[PDB]
Symmetry: D2
Subunit: 271 residues, 4 copies
Amino acid sequence: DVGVLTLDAPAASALPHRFRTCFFPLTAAVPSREGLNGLRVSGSSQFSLAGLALMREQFPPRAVIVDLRRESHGFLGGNAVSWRLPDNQGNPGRDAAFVAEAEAALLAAIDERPDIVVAREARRGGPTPLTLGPLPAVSEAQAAASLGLGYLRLAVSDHTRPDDAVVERFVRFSRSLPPDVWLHFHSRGGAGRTTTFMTLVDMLRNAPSVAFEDIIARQKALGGSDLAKTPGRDALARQRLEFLRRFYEYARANPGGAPLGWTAWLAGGAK
Amino acid sequence: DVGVLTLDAPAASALPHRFRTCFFPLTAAAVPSREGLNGLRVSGSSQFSLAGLALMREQFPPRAVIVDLRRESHGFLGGNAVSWRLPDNQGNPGRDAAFVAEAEAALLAAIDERPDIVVAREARRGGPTPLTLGPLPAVSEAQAAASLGLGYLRLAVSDHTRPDDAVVERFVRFSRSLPPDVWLHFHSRGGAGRTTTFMTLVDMLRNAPSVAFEDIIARQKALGGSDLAKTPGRDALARQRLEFLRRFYEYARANPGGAPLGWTAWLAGGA
Amino acid sequence: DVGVLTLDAPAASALPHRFRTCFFPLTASAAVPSREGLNGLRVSGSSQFSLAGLALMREQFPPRAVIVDLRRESHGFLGGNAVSWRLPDNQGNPGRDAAFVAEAEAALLAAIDERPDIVVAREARRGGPTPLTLGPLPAVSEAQAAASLGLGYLRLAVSDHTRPDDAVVERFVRFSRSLPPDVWLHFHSRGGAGRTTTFMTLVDMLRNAPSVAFEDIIARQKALGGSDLAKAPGRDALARQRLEFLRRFYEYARANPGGAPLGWTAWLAGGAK
Amino acid sequence: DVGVLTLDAPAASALPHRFRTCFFPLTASAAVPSREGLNGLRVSGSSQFSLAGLALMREQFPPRAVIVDLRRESHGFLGGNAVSWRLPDNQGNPGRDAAFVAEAEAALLAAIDERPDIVVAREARRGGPTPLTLGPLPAVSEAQAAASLGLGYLRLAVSDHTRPDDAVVERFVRFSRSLPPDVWLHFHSRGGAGRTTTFMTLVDMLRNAPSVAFEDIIARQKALGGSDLAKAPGRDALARQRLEFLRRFYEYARANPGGAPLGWTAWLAGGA
Ligand SMILES: O=P(O)(O)O[C@H]1[C@H](OP(=O)(O)O)[C@@H](OP(=O)(O)O)[C@H](OP(=O)(O)O)[C@@H](OP(=O)(O)O)[C@H]1OP(=O)(O)O
Ligand SMILES: O=P(O)(O)O[C@H]1[C@H](OP(=O)(O)O)[C@@H](OP(=O)(O)O)[C@H](OP(=O)(O)O)[C@@H](OP(=O)(O)O)[C@H]1OP(=O)(O)O
Ligand SMILES: O=P(O)(O)O[C@H]1[C@H](OP(=O)(O)O)[C@@H](OP(=O)(O)O)[C@H](OP(=O)(O)O)[C@@H](OP(=O)(O)O)[C@H]1OP(=O)(O)O
Ligand SMILES: O=P(O)(O)O[C@H]1[C@H](OP(=O)(O)O)[C@@H](OP(=O)(O)O)[C@H](OP(=O)(O)O)[C@@H](OP(=O)(O)O)[C@H]1OP(=O)(O)O
């Protein structure tokens, strides 16, 4: 069971939903803004190919698309499509290396073939399905490269916090970035997963100087979701908020991911 | 048998060997035609260290892409570029980039942050005594490129060998999808056969209708590449490669820039 | 009379007031105007920035970005502080083009470069009314400030509270036509309102006038964070002259998409169609 | 006397003569000079370019690149053609700074903008001796040409065949110190030889003087494609004056790496 091939964003869509950068205005009470503008971070929902090209017009030099979707996905023509299991829990427990190979085979099987049936939710032009093809099927990694943009894949399950291995890899990644690299995160809807990692970036820089509640509140006011909003989905949201509180303390004791990493800090009892 | 872990370039290495751009001077033989060469938006080199990549980035234009042509599994252990070398460097034989990416990911994971990792060294790279390294971070080149805000494309080409038809097909489609501002930097292990082959393909896709086959081959050598016209096992592969380049030249003359027909579609029209 | 040396933005200021890009959200006043063609304009605007503010904006500027300075008045930077020479109604270098202004302000900046006891006036809104005494500090033009960051720079002398002269409109239309598809324009004036919003509107019209109503372009440039160009008799006369100009330029842009085939002066010479 | 309007580069010209970056190979004359610190200078140079030539060079320019125009003589573009106003020995705007030059050349360009029958002289090396008759064509400064491509622009008025004035050196050192680590400088003059190589050398010294010998820096800037700053009594005196200045700047850069803690003129005050 590889899931139902489903539409994420039609080829005709432009700027993806929930697009925002750390320079956007805050929509309210209003939390502290200290250290927000300088984070070199933005986020959005899943984009079409045209939407990516549009965003690139305002991307700075040396920008990176950080794909947070553990589920297999890609592009059929300009259409962003994905393979949806129940609760969108594709490739459960799999890392980005496994996911990349699995979704590559799925995309290869629909490349330049007619009569590809793509399901559509009501919010995305449904409920009637969309029949497409023959069209080129490509991964988002290649889509990003075709525009001269960096690409990093981190497998995060929908509605779920990132695994400890994903957090460790991202913190190490963040430390390695030259000062001029810009990160654009995205998930499917640009809400939970996207807002979580924009928050991690915010904490890695500002946790020593900005309150936990202000970071969570301002990432919402920027256009993200409310990570402080917390049975199945509620429990995952509670688990996520607990992780964010624990990561906040980590970032306070290890500004910018140093001197200790995430897993090393946990192994030492979070001293 | 996954091969011997071998050094490609030590962390201390700077600009990789055989680095050149389409703007470099031509070193003569008679000097070939230069029509259409400067405007190709292409460069090439041998395998680089992390420091070497960062140095090259200082002179990369906006929206630059690292095109990794190595079918063999490789990556970075610290700043050191390392690879798993089978006999004749024929790792992952017959495998595509999706298979290679996952296979090398596991290999890199097995040496990540571990002490006493023995890295073989050829005489030309400081050998025959090996290097004992660790604990050091092991990362794929995909992540190394992303950490600098650079694009990354992986195409699995066997050392000493032409690219498979499927690889050619994928690259021509990739080439057609590039906006006019995207820059491609190819590299292999030595920056000779495979690197020069693909710089030649880019040259032909733009200039085959107006520049002679022999001038393209000769000027890619004069830029700092290898001589693809120089052609028992290796000699047969070199002949196969040269014959392929002659066919692609014919394709590119009849289909400027890879249109209207693709590579495999064009092949179907043969006698 | 060269005017009073006045503070535009203190060195400690970060993101300049009224900063917005064509990707920013629209705040309605009235229904939200049409968004067709807005995101793709490759344009942003702001008020006068400090040096630190320019470096901050650069973090989000795309490659090949241009700082378009619309200030006819002489101005520059003393250290990180943005300063200018303000005549009554801020009408410095009246009727002068960018070439004249550049040389004039260059000498003014030279006279305060690395010298102590430079008295800079401050309006209440910019930390006043008490003055600011600075120095010794480096005095540089904005042209050099932009170059020091690898940013393009274009100077167009537009008077405060006033439309751009025909010669300025012609020069900008030609400039616009010459831009490769990847060049980004960031306009700024002193307050990032009238003059900045006028030129963001010109950019908007040059692309969208054939497909978007005049009122929608004016309203959405306001909703982006600019001023209301459709909103003190002498001041009102200039605003009326400006709106009349924008209506005439709209017709120009409808007949000559993107500034072609005819330029602004040629279109006017032909009797507007 | 504002000089003869002369062609620098025709519109059809592509990559300018003597184009090179600090990543280019070194051509030996003598042993190959030291390469330490050369690749990381973020610097390039060339002769005067046409508009098409600038667009071509931009294809390989990194982000945040700056065109540094070292020409004290008035010049600009008539269409795609690079043109200039040449006085005897190309000594236009003698003793004038960039602020004066920019306004003077702006008026000269305005006087030929969109006018027919503009006569542009041509030297033998540039298709002469017969002149070009052009127009109507748009006349723009190089400042605007760079801006139209999203490239930075800095003007430093240096006389042909001559070292930079102390005030120009002071301004450039201050400019260099103010650059973020990602800014790239592309110098150019008319021929990309004396003046261009001089400032590529100044950049080299500001970074590497403490660790690289004076003779290696001079020799490698030539081997990169520049001219020989160590190589007509009047011209010889200027070249000797220029080499002496380069020796003093080398000592300044050794004692003040990167232009700090002392500036150029402040350092000169400490002499005997
Ligand atoms: O893509 P959308 O139609 O906008 O749906 C989103 C998306 O969920 P899906 O992937 O199932 O579509 C969000 O998740 P991410 O892809 O950004 O990670 C999710 O966020 P949470 O998992 O945190 O709940 C969000 O839910 P919410 O609105 O509660 O933030 C939900 O939107 P809807 O609930 O409106 O469907
Ligand atoms: O990396 P190097 O030590 O510089 O060796 C290179 C490299 O071969 P290896 O990968 O085995 O090292 C070249 O291949 P690419 O990685 O660039 O594809 C190969 O080129 P060919 O495939 O055309 O043989 C070239 O050989 P040649 O000199 O014939 O160009 C060979 O150099 P050596 O013969 O000195 O080992
Ligand atoms: O700089 P500010 O303190 O923010 O004041 C601005 C600024 O006026 P000044 O240049 O005199 O400071 C605007 O002008 P620009 O520099 O952007 O061209 C002007 O716009 P107008 O010239 O069109 O009147 C605007 O006025 P408004 O908000 O009506 O657009 C006015 O703001 P205040 O009226 O609040 O002083
Ligand atoms: O443009 P070119 O025809 O190539 O001439 C150049 C140019 O002189 P002109 O400005 O008169 O043309 C050089 O000066 P720059 O513009 O680069 O500053 C000059 O260098 P010097 O000022 O050091 O004399 C150089 O002379 P040389 O090559 O001897 O260094 C000379 O080239 P030619 O000597 O071949 O005429």
